[PDB]
């Protein structure tokens with residue numbers, strides 16, 4: 001698990017995200033799509049986006065970035081006590097959206113990248129450590145639900 005101190009760091013970093021939820025959400029998805037174009041193919045409503053300029057100008061992509069980070073923020077504020085919040089997300093990502101766990105690794109990496117990119121010098125080694133742990137807890141608890149479903 002994470003320590004009390006580590007949770008405090010995680011939720012302190014998250015305060016940065018909440019100052020511009022849509023902006024952070026959009027950059028996370030753009031980083032995911034551009035670094036891993038196979039991921040874009042999982043989204044029927046975003047696969048029309050051919051260039052980063054189109055992605056950047058998509059108001060619906062910003063909207064979905066808001067949905068995504070609002071859900072993740074809810075989970076992180078549970079500090080590991082997130083079974084009821086996490087299970088349904090795990091289940092829709094495996095069963096409906098067909099998202100391999102690797103793509104969750106990709107988006108964890110993208111969040112870390114975006115945090116550094118948006119807050120250069122304001123996302124210290126201790127904070128990266130804490131947030132990385134939170135994100136591996138998230139990914140690991142989803143992977144358990146994936147195994148249950150036998151989903152690959």
Ligand code: HEM
Pocket residue numbers: 039040042043044045067068069071072088089092093097099103104107
């Ligand atoms: C931080 C991790 C993630 C969070 C918090 C998250 C959250 C959400 C939420 C809250 C929804 C809407 C409700 C639902 O369908 O369950 C959603 C939909 C969706 N998610 Fe994610 N997700 C994450 C990772 C991913 C990844 C890595 C992919 C890979 C492509 C993905 C693909 C999708 C797709 C295709 C939908 C349907 C979008 C639509 O057409 O409306 N998600 N996600």
